[PDB]
From Swiss-Prot:
Subcellular location: Cell membrane
Similarity comment: family membership: Belongs to the UPF0053 family.
Entire-sequence positions represented here: 343 to 420 of 420
Organism: Haemophilus influenzae (strain ATCC 51907 / DSM 11121 / KW20 / Rd)
Full protein name: UPF0053 protein HI_0107
Species lineage: Bacteria, Pseudomonadati, Pseudomonadota, Gammaproteobacteria, Pasteurellales
Length: 81
């Protein structure tokens, strides 16, 4: 999985990103109990496959959905809360 730091400090993360990997690398505190990937975490929280452009808060992160495909989150922008 790829993750790109933006000039403004935000991160663009792939939906496929492994939650435990993200936590260890960025010192985030994503819940790893039930989901394995960033996509999984977002889907478990939403009661509908979210549109691109959706902004949500999960586990200390402010997340903007950038790309959705095959009913999975492909890319999201992330800022720390």
């Amino acid at each position: 999985s790829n993750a790109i730091q933006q000039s403004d400090g935000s991160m663009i993360i792939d939906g496929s990103a492994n939650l435990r990997d993200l936590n260890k690398m960025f010192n985030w505190e994503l819940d790893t109990e039930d989901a394995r990937t960033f996509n999984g975490l977002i889907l478990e929280h939403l009661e509908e496959i979210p549109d691109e452009g959706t902004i949500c808060e999960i586990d200390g992160l402010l997340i903007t959905i950038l790309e959705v495909g095959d009913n999975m989150i492909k890319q999201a922008k992330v800022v720390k809360l």
